[PDB]
Amino acid sequence: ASPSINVALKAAFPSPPYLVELLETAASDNTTIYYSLLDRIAKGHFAEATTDKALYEKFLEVLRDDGHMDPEALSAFKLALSLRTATPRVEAHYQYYTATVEPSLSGTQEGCDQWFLIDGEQYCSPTLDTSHGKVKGEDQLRTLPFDRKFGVGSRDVILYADITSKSFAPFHEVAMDLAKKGKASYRVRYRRSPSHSRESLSVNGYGVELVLKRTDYIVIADIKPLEKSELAALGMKAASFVMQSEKPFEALLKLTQDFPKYSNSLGSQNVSAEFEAEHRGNREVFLPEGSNVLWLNGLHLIDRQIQPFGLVDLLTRERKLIKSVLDLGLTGQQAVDLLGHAEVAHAKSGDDEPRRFDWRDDIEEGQVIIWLNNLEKDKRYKSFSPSIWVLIHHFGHGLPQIRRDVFNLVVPVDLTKADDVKIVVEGLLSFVKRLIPVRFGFVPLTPTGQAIDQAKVVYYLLENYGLAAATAYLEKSYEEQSTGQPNERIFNEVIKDKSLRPDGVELSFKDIFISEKHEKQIHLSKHWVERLRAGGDVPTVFFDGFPIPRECNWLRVMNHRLMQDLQALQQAGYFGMLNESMWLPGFFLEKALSRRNTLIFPEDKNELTVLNVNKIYIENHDLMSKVPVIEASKESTRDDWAALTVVADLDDIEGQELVYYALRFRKSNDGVRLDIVHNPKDTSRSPSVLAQRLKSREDKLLDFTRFLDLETALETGEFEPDVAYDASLANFLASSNMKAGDNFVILNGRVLGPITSADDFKKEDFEVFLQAERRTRILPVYKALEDLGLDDKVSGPLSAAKLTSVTALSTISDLPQGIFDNAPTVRTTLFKQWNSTYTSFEVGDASTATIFFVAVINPASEIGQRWVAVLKVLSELEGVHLRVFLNPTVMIEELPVKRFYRYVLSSSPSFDESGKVKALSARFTGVPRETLLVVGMDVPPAWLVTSKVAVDDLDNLRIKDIKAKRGTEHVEAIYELEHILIEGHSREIPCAHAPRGVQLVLETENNPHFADTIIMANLGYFQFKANPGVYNIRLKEGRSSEIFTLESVGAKGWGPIPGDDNTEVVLMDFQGTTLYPRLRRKPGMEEEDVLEPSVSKTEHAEINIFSVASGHLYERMLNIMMASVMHHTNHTVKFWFIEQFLSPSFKDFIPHMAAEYGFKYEMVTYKWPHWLRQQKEKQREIWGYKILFLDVLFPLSLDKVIFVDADQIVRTDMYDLVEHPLDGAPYGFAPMCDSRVEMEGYRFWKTGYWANYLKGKPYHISALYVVDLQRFRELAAGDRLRQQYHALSADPNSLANLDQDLPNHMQFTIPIATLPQEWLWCETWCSDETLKDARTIDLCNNPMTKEPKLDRARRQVPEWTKYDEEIAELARRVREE
Ligand SMILES: *[C@@H]1O[C@H](CO)[C@@H](O[C@@H]2O[C@H](CO)[C@@H](O[C@@H]3O[C@H](CO)[C@@H](O)[C@H](O)[C@@H]3O)[C@H](O)[C@H]2NC(C)=O)[C@H](O)[C@H]1NC(C)=O
Ligand SMILES: *[C@@H]1O[C@H](CO)[C@@H](O)[C@H](O)[C@H]1NC(C)=O
Ligand SMILES: *[C@@H]1O[C@H](CO)[C@@H](O)[C@H](O)[C@H]1NC(C)=O
Ligand SMILES: *[C@@H]1O[C@H](CO)[C@@H](O)[C@H](O)[C@H]1NC(C)=O
Ligand SMILES: *[C@@H]1O[C@H](CO)[C@@H](O)[C@H](O)[C@H]1NC(C)=O
Known part of the structure; x- marks a missing residue:
């Protein structure tokens, strides 16, 4: 009866047959469940179930009866089945089959519905007598992510089947038995089944929001009544409402979904009931007011992990872990308690700490390290104090001078290699001369004959003559001879002068093979290098017993530990641990090991593998x-x-x-x-x-x-x-x-x-x-x-390993530290301290539950709206326990919740009257008739969504207007999940840095150019828009492949996990594909892509113009803008649009505009990065889209683009803007008009802030501009725009209009070519005399009037109507076509 709004989402691929979907969902990753079910349907067992419901009904009885699932796992099956998690996994098969199988299988296929592939030979019959073909292309025997294998066998067999038909059953049995015997290993691949229709897939697991676009007003339903600003109590009164109710969970959902509507309805019926100001005893100990925090068995989850898909995957991983533990007689409650124990977390923190190795000569009897320093006896440092209190009384990033032994650095050097020798001579000595408080040592490396000799030579020269003489040989050798081999012409000169008075034991000269000097010294040295694995292709430097490989800027790494060690000394000093007669380097050597194993103590700290x-x-x-x-x-x-x-x-x-x-x-x-x-x-x-x-x-x-x-x-x-x-x-x-x-x-x-x-x-x-x-x-x-007193459960060495191995696996993050959050994977138990009586409520049995959820939600938050909705559905699962804490804030300067929210999700599937699976939708009932609303989709991070079906303006919704225009109070809109992201974080190898300006190409066997993007500076970020299927990533041919070779796409994890030296990406999930690629520079390169050592026109058009419109009016004005260009140029034009901000009405119309006006068009978009700072306000989002992603929004093949605002009109042939010289600048803008005489008052860019900042530079207009894209990318302008935006954006009042303000704030840093003002006209700021020579007109705001945009157009431009009439009749011509 009430006025309603209904929103539904459908995928970009057809719905796979329900049968195959249940098989996949059912057997998540247990293969035995898969083939054990594959037997059942090959009986023809599942043939007698006519409908999806019946079919679903049948699976429940089967799984329970065959022992496959218990209550806990069955419940998890229903939810995952609702989510339709297995549908993209099945579509992966099809896309693979369509793009690599069919074109590599030449011949005439008829009757070959199913066929095994053996030794590049196809067999359409089980009896296997005849083979149709030698299959063309690359091997299909590569094991890929969606594969399953049954049995071990020398020979490998593959069956491409359409399971749906009865024709399948005999083929299966032939290879099931063949695998049961052991002749070969069995695996099933899918074939798109033509028994099913090409209907699209209806999805769920997303949220819809109805955003109030007018928030300015504050001092069944018509409009929300704005109430006198006593905001402060909303959270507090809101929290009480619920507590009081006693059906609390439902209240929060009902309250939190329609919250803006209930604002004035709060503060009623002796409302506060603030017994719970008691529980800020809770606040006093742990978390700040109004903060949302979720825990899953101690694990602190980030926001991105809090969707239905992210959460289903977590339970799946967690239960496997716990069940493993509870086969040793531990309750779920005891198991979790052990996992989040204080002694456990302490250990992780404990070996996050550095381990040191004993760098001393003591074992090698002081005959291996040749120091260039002594700080206690060098008469350089003589000036300095040898006091402990010099260390302790330090602040800053400066190095404290001291005459003491405290910091040491030993660097192993190869005397054959020039680069190695240069380190000692230039690098090590400067540091000496500089009076740095660090002792510098070096030990030669002995991997070849020449190296052995030169260690002997230098060692001898030190022994009799001294350090300076040895130093001397090294210095001279480097400049003079420039090679490792010993040079007497160089050597003899050194002794000639430097051989004055060689003290102690006499020099022997000329030739060395001292039984002791060559044997003891060289072999003792070798014993030092071997002991600490300080050699090879990449040697290892030891600073305070801390290994730092000799790569990149190791001194940068050394300096970091130098400061970190100093702070370690200071804290011991303030506790009085230290005393004046002490060897300070031995504070570090207390726990140091004599021998170093690279396997146990890998220098890549992450490298760790544990098995259950x-x-x-x-x-x-x-x-x-x-x-x-x-x-x-x-x-x-x-x-x-x-x-x-x-x-x-x-x-x-x-x-x-x-x-x-x-x-x-x-x-x-x-x-x-x-x-x-x-x-x-x-x-x-x-x-x-x-x-x-x-x-x-x-x-x-x-x-x-x-x-x-x-x-x-x-x-x-x-x-x-x-x-x-x-x-x-x-x-x-x-x-x-x-x-x-x-x-x-x-x-x-x-x-x-x-x-x-x-x-x-x-x-x-x-x-x-x-x-x-x-x-x-x-x-x-x-x-x-x-x-915990569970120490009865340990009955032996194997018994113990089960527990220790499980708890080590618990603390390994799915998400690499430093990407989504810096915080480590530490399971807290710290909320157990909290008093619970008046703020908490629990759902599910704690005694039986394997899953324990702890939610800390602020009722006044918009983030809370989503959290409640999702958590209610996961609470419905059996074997899950949930406990909720409500924590509001007293700090409410502005309205807390400014939107209505609905989450599309069910805990078990719903069925039709005809037994088909019910599609899920977001239905808002009893919507206020007078409130202006904006429809928004709150979709999981990997998803890209646009409106497909709507007749209404989703940006400007009002029921009263729709009722008065359409006659209906009911609104229906349909979205499309058009793309799913492939996103990754790159690194260079071995000296890991983000490769920025690197270009990438995504490909498929059908087409070698699916997509392209460029690598970003921040986290080596990149993304692709794709759907389920098998893809490949090749570096774009040109400079990129010249400089680099990419060893891998990080599809297994941050790793390297062995077996991932691959460049293949596959997406078979609604979570997309997360990648961590690696690129290693080609021989001797410090090169940069960004600096040098008719294409675009042909592909696209003479002119490339791009725009965005956020309303029916603005889209109507955009139609006019395009037409004005066309009438005004005898040239070829291509139009580019920001896809997701446009209406389906507009979207369905353009081919008709393109046929009439003779232009080409392309829809573009990019998803706002997770690291990059969001815009809660849509208008601000739009502005960001025009400036932040210019380099990545358009294909690489595009030389240049032009932005023209929707309200604009052009009388010029637009090419001229292309030909305009930009004088090596990335983009060109037009300035603000000075010509209008009496307008000055409203010219705010002549004020203190803008005039101080823009010293002499102009205040530019973002209505029209040119981007020389090739130069833009070459200058890597985008990266700078993005990081300045992120940095500036911390302050909310930072950018009034970011689009205009960002290029103006960056014109010092990034050149802006300034345009002739023939290029812009605006009545408000330009004189009437000016418009004769005007090229284009923006309709800039009044503001000494209130005349609206529709009025300016008709009055300002007489030909505006002529354009409008043309569009108007065509729209009717189409409607009547
Ligand atoms: C993958 O699926 C298979 C089959 O559903 C699972 O194997 C089954 O595991 C149960 C134990 O949960 C077996 O039952 C009994 O286990 C006890 C263990 O002490 C043993 O003493 C009994 O003799 C008996 O084996 C059961 O036999 C076995 N098979 C079936 C058909 O139920 C397997 O656990 C699953 N793997 C994962 C990763 O969960
Ligand atoms: C209701 O609130 C008023 C105002 O705070 C107070 O005077 C009154 O005693 C309260 N009612 C009861 C039953 O305590
Ligand atoms: C929990 O409540 C008890 C009883 O009022 C109190 O003694 C204790 O200090 C409270 N805990 C905190 C941390 O506020
Ligand atoms: C404290 O001074 C003593 C006495 O000289 C010295 O042997 C030692 O290094 C210092 N520390 C301890 C723990 O004794
Ligand atoms: C388009 O072509 C015609 C014929 O050559 C020419 O007269 C006209 O001026 C051209 N249009 C414009 C505005 O350049």
């Missing part, structure tokens, strides 16, 4: 119950307990050497439980045989006095291959992402490898690996666990 241990012994029970196992001792303690697994190729020396060390390590440590997995490179001979050889010797293991006893044990015995073992073996490696013939080590779930050489991992290396690992992962689990 319970999973490993559950999935591969067949394998792990038949591996040689050394049980850890009967009589050893819980603290001693640890579990180790060695994966090695026993057909290689390195593989068997590695195991000997592991066995040795086991003899010493009684607490460890060892497992041996034989992973061979060549699988011609069964892996089961060598495993069977050892399990017989299992009892006798580690009784190998010598290595050959192990070697011999491998050779002897006759065995029968357990081919069941072999199958589980190759499944394990596939699950664990391990290659064949690769060596790996696993202690308590953590993987290190591949081990190329067994010398890398020795007995001593296992000991530290256990020592370190023990500390972090095991000791925080043990304490925490015991604190």
Whole structure:
């Protein structure tokens, strides 16, 4: 009965058959569920269900009956099925099939509905007698993201099927059995089924907003009554309303959805009931008022993760983790409590801290490091104080001078290499001369003959003659001979003068092979380099025992730690830890290790892989119950307990050497439980045989006095291959992402490898690996666990590993730190302190719940509107517990909620009267008749959405006008999910920086140019607009491919995860594709793209003009603007539009404008980056679109573009603007008119702020401008605009009209070519005499009148009507066509 508004969203691809959708949703990533269901439908079991409802009904009985899902998992299935999560996954198959399969399968297809692909041969029959073709193109056997494999088999078989028909069932069974036997491995790919219709897909999981566009007024429903500004209590009274109700959850939803309407309805019926000013005892301890914060089992979630898709994926990952834990008899409540424990979080913070290695000469008896300094005895520093209090009493970024030993830097240098030598001579010495408070040492590198000799030479020269003489040889050699090889012509000259009085033990001269000097010194040096792995292609520098690889600007890194170490000393001083007679460098060396392993302590800190241990012994029970196992001792303690697994190729020396060390390590440590997995490179001979050889010797293991006893044990015995073992073996490696013939080590779930050489991992290396690992992962689990009194649940080394391995996996973020939020992955328990009686309410059983949600919502917030709606639907799930906290603010200067909100989402699917799946819509009932509203879509981050069907103005909605024009009080609008984003964050390799100005191309097998974009400075950001399918990213041919080669697109994560050295992107989700690509510079380049060492016209048009309109009037005026151009030029024109701000009425009309006026048009858009600062006010968004994304909004093929405002009219042939010389400037603008005489008062750009800032420069107009795009990108102007905007935008009153203000604020930095004023006319600021020579007219605002825009046009321009008539009759001609 009430006046309503209905909004629906539909995808850009047709709806896949429901059957296949349920298969995919059902078996998320468990393959067994997939094929176990694929059997069921190949019976013809699902043939008897006629309707989607019945079909859906059937799946529930099946899953429950076959043991696939429990209540918790079934409930999760329904929600994910509502969300239609599996539909893009299915469309991936189709797009792949349409674009790579069909054009590479030459011949005549008839009867080949289904067909296996074997050895590039197609078989249309199960009986497999005849093969139709040799398939053209690249291999289809590449395993890609949407693939599934069933069984292990040498041969690989693929079936492209249309499951829908009965023709499928026999084909399946042929290969299911073939895989069951073990002949080959089975996988299914899809074929678009023509039994189904081409109807588009109706989506859900988004939000709709109705924004009040007039907020100025403040002192069933007609209009909101504006109430006297007693805003301050809204949050507080609003919070009480709910608490009082006692059906609280529903109140908040009902209140929060229509909140603007209920503002004046609050403060009534002795309203405050402020018992809860009590709970700011809650505020006093933890969070600030009016802040929204969500936690999921301690995990603090960012806003972007708080959508239905983001949340479904989190539960899925979390339950897998918890279920693993609760097979050891822990309640969901106990499990979570252990995960978020204080001792656990402390450990993460603990090894976020730096680990140091002992850089001293002590082991090598002081004969390896050749220092250029001594700060306690150098008579340069003599002037300085040797006092501790010099350190402690410091502030700033300046280096404190001191005569003390406190900071050291040891840099290993190769004396053959010029660049290396140059470091010492220029780099190291300047620092000395400069009186820096750092001691500088260097140790030569000995990887070649010449290097060995030159270390000897320099070492000798130091020993007898001294530092200066040695220094001297080095300096002279660098300039003089310019090579590593020793030069006597250079050497002898040095001794000639520098050989005066070589003290102590005498010089021997001429030739060196001192038994001691060559042996001891060089081999001691080698022992130092080897010990700390300070050599290779990339050497390692040690500052205060902290490894810094010799790359990029390592001194920048050193300076960072130098200040960070100083602050570490200061704090010990204020606690009085320090004293005057102390060796300060040993404050750092307290916990330092003598030996450094790059595997255990990788210098890429992120590099860490942990596996779920319970999973490993559950999935591969067949394998792990038949591996040689050394049980850890009967009589050893819980603290001693640890579990180790060695994966090695026993057909290689390195593989068997590695195991000997592991066995040795086991003899010493009684607490460890060892497992041996034989992973061979060549699988011609069964892996089961060598495993069977050892399990017989299992009892006798580690009784190998010598290595050959192990070697011999491998050779002897006759065995029968357990081919069941072999199958589980190759499944394990596939699950664990391990290659064949690769060596790996696993202690308590953590993987290190591949081990190329067994010398890398020795007995001593296992000991530290256990020592370190023990500390972090095991000791925080043990304490925490015991604190809760769950320490009864640990029954052995394997029992313990399950827990420790699970809790290590809990703290690994999905999102790399520094991108979406800087904050680390630390699970807080800090809200448990909070009193709950009067602000909290809980939903779901805590006793049974596996999922625990903690929401802190401010009722007055607009963000809260979304949060409540989503959380209500996730609360409906069984096995989920939710607890809500309401926290309003007293600080309300402006109206808090200025919109109505509806979230389109259901917890379980809805069905038709005819049993089809119900589409979901946002229906607003009882909308005020007199309020002007704006329709907005609050869509998940990866989505790009535009209006498709609407007859109304969504920018200016009013029921009274629609009623008086259309006769209906009911509004319906349909949107289209046109694109889904592929977005990523780039980095250069190895010295990781964002490559800006790099150009990229997206491609498909059908077309080599889907899309193109350029790399941004901020986070090496880039994006593409695409739909489900298989794509590839190639650097654009030109300068980009000249300078770089991209090793990878980061599709597996930040990584590098092995197996990701790929450039293939696929999108099979509503979350799009997130990528972290890597690019390494080609041989010796410090080059830059941005600086140099008829195309666009042909592709597009003579003239390229772009614009935006945000109303029916402005779109009507835009039609006139385009026409005026056309009449005024005998040239070719192409028009460009900002797609999402335009009406469907306008969108449906243009082809008709294009046919009549003879122009070309193209729709463009870009999605506002997540890092870039948003605009809550739509008009401001629009302005941002014209200036912020100029370089990335238009294809690279476009040389230049021109912006013309919608209200404008042009009498000029527009080419002239193209030909206008810009004098090497990126863009050109026209200034403000000075010509009108008496207008001055309203000329605000002659005031203090604008005249002080614009010293001599003009105040420009954003109605018309030229962008020399090629130059724009070349100058990388965009990046500067974007970062200045982001920086300025922190202040809300910063840019009145950003579009005009940003180019004006940046004209110092970025040149603006100024235009002849023949180019702009405006009555308000230009004289009437001026318009004779006027080229174009903007209709700028009155403001000494109130005459409106429609009036100015008719009065100001007589030919405006002529243009309007032309459009008017055509629109009617179309309507009557
Ligand atoms: C992937 O799906 C399969 C099949 O649905 C899951 O396997 C099933 O796991 C259950 C345990 O949840 C097995 O039941 C029993 O487990 C106990 C464990 O102690 C064991 O002692 C019993 O003998 C029995 O196996 C069940 O047999 C097994 N298969 C089926 C058809 O139910 C598997 O857990 C799923 N994987 C993931 C990642 O969840
Ligand atoms: C209702 O509020 C008024 C004003 O604060 C107060 O005088 C009155 O006592 C309240 N009613 C009750 C039942 O306490
Ligand atoms: C929680 O309430 C109790 C009882 O009034 C009080 O003693 C305690 O301090 C409160 N906690 C906080 C942090 O306000
Ligand atoms: C304190 O002074 C003593 C005495 O000279 C010295 O041996 C030591 O380095 C200092 N610190 C401690 C912990 O004794
Ligand atoms: C278009 O072409 C005609 C014929 O050559 C010419 O007379 C006319 O002036 C041209 N239009 C304009 C405005 O340049």
